[PDB]
Amino acid sequence: MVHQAISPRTLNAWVKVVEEKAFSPEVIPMFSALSEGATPQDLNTMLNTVGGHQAAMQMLKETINEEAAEWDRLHPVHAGPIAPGQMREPRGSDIAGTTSTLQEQIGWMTHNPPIPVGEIYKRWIILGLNKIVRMYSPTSILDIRQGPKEPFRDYVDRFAKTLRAEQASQEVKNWMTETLLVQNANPDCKTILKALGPGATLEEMMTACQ
């Protein structure tokens, strides 16, 4: 038997928090939707589909891990004959979706009485993320303006990565880049540069500032 489930549109939504808010806590419903209990697999999905903050993947992942520890700790994995293939008291693996893999899992989860794993596990998540908001704390390019006595060259270079590393829109990307570049030379260099007025390729201007 198979119920119909989780669209990729809904994924698109999940995605969409990322797409809105890739690495920024304007999260709340998005989680709430995604925390429609879920199983591992979906949850696994979200975390699979997750990017942005590897560190966040981390943060949860310890949290989870100790949640697992806690699971075993609050339920020290009590053995038996496992008469009619039970629930196999959830671990980190289960939290991976492994141990009564998803059908079977859901099978526990909507085993009635349940063993509704992804939700428990969900509590594990549930445990991190907020704190993740509490944890993660951006980020910004603008300040990539050249250091105190930082040299230019690097400054643009750095900048160059950083712009590489920055957001969407080529158009923006070009013009902004000059436009933000300007001040991202540090004032003194920028002043030289301003004193250059224009230039084109970096390099000549730069060449002055090396």
Say whether residue 92 binds its own copies (CB under 8 A): no
Sort residue 101 into left (φ over 0), alpha (ψ -120 to 50) or beta: beta
Q: How many residues does the chain have?
A: 210
Rounded Cα distance, 96 and 100, in Å: 11
Amino acid at 111: H
Query: In the complex, what is the shortest distance from the CB of residue 203 to its own copies, in angstroms, rounded to a whole number?
Result: 5
Say whether residue 178 binds its own copies (CB under 8 A): no
Say whether residue 170 binds its own copies (CB under 8 A): no
Say whether residue 188 binds its own copies (CB under 8 A): yes
Segment contacting its own copies by CB under 8 A, of 28-36, 53-61, 147-155, 168-176: 147-155
**Whether the Cβ atoms of residue 17 and residue 33 lie closer than 8 Å to each other:** no
Of the candidates 33, 39, 35, the one whose C-alpha atom is nearest the C-alpha of residue 97 is 39
The residue (of 3 and 164) whose beta carbon lies closer to its own copies is: 164
Contacts of 92-96 with C-beta under 8 Å, sequence gap 24+, read 92/64, 92/65, 92/68, 94/40, 94/121, 95/40, 95/64, 95/67, 95/68, 95/121, 95/124, 96/40, 96/44
- Cα torsion 182, 186, 187, 193: sign: negative
In terms of Cβ atoms closer than 10 Å to its own Cβ (0-12, 13-18, 19+), residue 32 is: exposed
Say whether residue 41 binds its own copies (CB under 8 A): yes
Say whether residue 168 binds its own copies (CB under 8 A): no
Say whether residue 3 binds its own copies (CB under 8 A): no
Segment contacting its own copies by CB under 8 A, of 3-11, 54-62, 108-116, 199-207: 199-207
Rounded Cα distance, 192 and 157, in Å: 17
Say whether residue 208 binds its own copies (CB under 8 A): yes
Which residue in the set 164, 197, 198, 200 belongs to the binding site for its own copies (CB under 8 A)? 164
Which residue in the set 26, 36, 143, 178 belongs to the binding site for its own copies (CB under 8 A)? 143
Which residue in the set 9, 173, 187, 194 belongs to the binding site for its own copies (CB under 8 A)? 187
Say whether residue 186 binds its own copies (CB under 8 A): yes
Q: Can you give the binding site for its own copies, defined by CB under 8 A? A: 41, 44, 48, 66, 70, 73, 76, 78, 97, 101-102, 135, 137, 142-143, 145-154, 157, 164, 183-190, 202-203, 206-210
